Design a protein around this ligand. Structure first.
Ligand SMILES: Nc1ncnc2c1ncn2[C@@H]1O[C@H](COP(=O)(O)OP(=O)(O)OP(=O)(O)O)[C@@H](O)[C@H]1O
Ligand SMILES: Nc1ncnc2c1ncn2[C@@H]1O[C@H](COP(=O)(O)O)[C@@H](O)[C@H]1O
Ligand SMILES: Nc1ncnc2c1ncn2[C@@H]1O[C@H](COP(=O)(O)O)[C@@H](O)[C@H]1O
Ligand SMILES: [Zn+2]
Ligand SMILES: [Zn+2]
Lengths: 378, 378
RNA sequence: CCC
């Protein structure tokens, strides 16, 4: 008696995700037997057929777990089912959840309904079986669909510090990018490359005016907040001063200058609120030597540099160990959910009840405040 | 020789229903091992306030099927999953459907996504194992949720002859009962007793002015139609003309006397259109020698006999042998789903693909049009 | 609010 396998389902987002983990030693990272992600945008490019997310998951979760089980050769083998319970569109959630319930009942095996974000949080620990980073740590999630700063004290205890009020970073970046006629799968990945290439070049006379909501450095309300929806409007009007119309016949020298400044400012804003948080509550961060930057936009170098430079020498004699997962794990996927559930199962010895329905809005601090949880055995 | 068991799921109504069937022999009727129904009420008024039916289904399917699998003694025994694909609310539907698919992937067994009404039509064939009634036959579906007349030429070939354009006879005999001073599970069944207990003792001088959906003249739907939502009103307008709440404090002789007439005038309307359709389309019925009347309200004895007598009018295109299934089969349940699945699997050698999604509104004629179906090896 |  040693080793268990885990079937993990993620459906909070646009992409249906299924994975299988062989948790062969409680001493070692699990091995990934199967990792399937069938996206809403992957049936569109070579598709021109636009589907609705809850229907996408409904249609793809069956064949996907079927494929996964075959690839993994593990149908008669799963021990735990983990599944994203919230937060998200409760249609898209019920897709995965009600299905995951099917597996569990059919197999007579435990189900864990997991916090989407706890996945993002806990993923950079899978690599080392939860030795790095050790709690407490802080984690900046920066995806197309979240932008949040989170102190994590224990597995059963997490506090959101700073959080967006409008859209997420990647969204607004992608949006700015698309207004400059980028089209790609990841619009802002493309726009970094663009800036990267011809640096000592771009019209240094172009100095557009972008904001960075520093009011929280004066009129402080109730919680601290990121905010990105202001950027695309600020771009448009700066265009509407100097050639919005020129959209097209600007040089492949200038367009690469609107880019770097749009990026710089929006990364300035994050750094601004990050600064304003650590400054104001040194007590909480006293005890933490590690900083995670997971999510999509983790993989930006300009950001990574700013983070390492403009923070990790401001908390006095407590540099930060920055850890950046592979964006192999940073995008939504069902692996994080699997890992997160191994951590719950092992460390709390909790599972979910079969009556758990989805949770539209699920504050991370309410992780175990909600019903569903029961102790496993002892 | 070999037999097989079926797990069948019905999640289209308000009630969460699951069944296991032993299809032990292809020359016998199958037996039921397990049949449960978690009615929406039992987790509302005795819990908190009124709960949405999709969350009901989501909350109850899993515990419910676990139990049924325990009772049936067959968690490892199921060879086929039958579940209601449509028609209804896609949130309700998809609770059971997404779940059902989970069972199917985990046990690696076929799924059949079943049409609710196919359920009701076929169920009388269950007991005789497909011999009685023989195709063609017509069926009259009179539940709290349907009032519909149907010709059935083959498993895969059903044609709706007349259908309600508003509420169903049940919903209508219920509100009428509610207004006469009744409550309960079957508000209208009760109304039957009140007049039954003392069939003679009723003020034979209380004649009431109820209508019969006044449209034998001014309407251009290509198709014949029932309607009931007038009767509640007619009754009210009438109870004005000769004493409001009098009902509540009238003799045994009067509460009944009007109830008999309301119950008459509704059945009258039903026999009326039933007659229209038998008259309009004579040779549609050429070889029909069987009339099934099923659904909640089919248990009523004035109906049963109005049917028997008033389409013995002049026995013409056919002389009908009536069949009235029990109420434990007529009211929504998962057994009829399971049976429909048997029929489909065995006769048509068909199953559903795991990509099947709900269908909100599913024409019975389109039973096999829609996507999903796939041949075993006919 | 809600499939
Ligand atoms: N006005 C409408 N426009 C588009 N779809 C509609 C409309 N009214 C009803 N629908 C139907 O309802 C569903 C779409 O709406 P719904 O909000 O339930 O889906 P969604 O946008 O993907 O949300 P969620 O993912 O949270 O369930 C589909 O099943 C669709 O057929
Ligand atoms: N180098 C990069 N610069 C800017 N955005 C990026 C980069 N790499 C990835 N992204 C963004 O990452 C997001 C992916 O979100 P998710 O799939 O949730 O990680 C997309 O919106 C991308 O535009
Ligand atoms: N003996 C009866 N006479 C008239 N209506 C009935 C009788 N029994 C049950 N019903 C009705 O059955 C309906 C519910 O539909 P069903 O889904 O078939 O149970 C309710 O409207 C009841 O009032
Ligand atoms: Zn995410
Ligand atoms: Zn029904």
């Amino acid at each position: 008696r040693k080793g268990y396998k885990v079937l993990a389902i993620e459906t909070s987002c646009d992409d249906t995700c299924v994975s299988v983990l062989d948790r062969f030693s409680k001493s070692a990272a699990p091995n990934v037997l199967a990792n399937l992600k069938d996206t809403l945008d992957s049936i569109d490019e070579g598709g021109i057929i636009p589907t609705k997310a809850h229907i996408h998951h409904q249609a793809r979760i069956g064949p996907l777990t079927e494929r996964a089980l075959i690839e993994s050769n593990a149908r008669e083998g799963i021990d735990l089912i983990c599944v994203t319970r919230g937060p998200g569109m409760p249609g898209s959630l019920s897709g995965g959840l009600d299905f995951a319930k099917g597996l569990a009942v059919a197999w007579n095996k435990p189900l864990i309904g997991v916090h989407h974000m706890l996945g993002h949080l806990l993923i950079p620990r899978m690599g080392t079986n939860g030795k790095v980073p050790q709690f407490p740590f802080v984690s900046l999630l920066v995806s197309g669909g979240h932008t949040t700063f989170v102190l994590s004290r224990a597995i059963d205890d997490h506090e959101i510090l700073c959080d967006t009020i409008d859209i997420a970073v990647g969204d607004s970046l992608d949006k700015c990018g698309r207004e400059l006629g980028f089209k790609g799968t990841m619009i802002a990945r493309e726009m970094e490359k663009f800036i990267n290439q011809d640096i000592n070049d771009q019209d240094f006379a172009l100095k557009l005016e972008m904001p960075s909501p520093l009011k929280n450095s004066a009129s402080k309300r109730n919680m601290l907040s990121f905010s990105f929806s202001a950027f695309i409007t600020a771009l448009r009007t700066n265009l509407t001063k100097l050639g919005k119309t020129e959209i097209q016949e600007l040089p492949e020298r200038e367009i690469r200058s609107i880019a770097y400044q749009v990026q710089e400012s929006v990364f300035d804003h994050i750094i601004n609120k990050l600064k304003h948080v650590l400054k104001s509550q040194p007590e909480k961060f006293k005890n933490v030597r590690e900083f995670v930057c997971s999510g999509g936009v983790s993989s930006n170098q300009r950001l990574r540099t700013k983070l390492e430079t403009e923070l990790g020498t401001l908390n006095s004699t407590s540099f930060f160990n920055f850890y950046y997962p592979p964006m192999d794990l940073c995008s939504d996927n069902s692996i994080m959910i699997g890992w997160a559930g191994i951590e719950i199962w092992e460390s709390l010895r909790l599972v979910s009840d079969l009556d758990i329905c989805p949770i539209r809005q699920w504050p991370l601090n309410d992780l175990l405040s909600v019903d569903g949880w029961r102790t496993d055995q002892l």
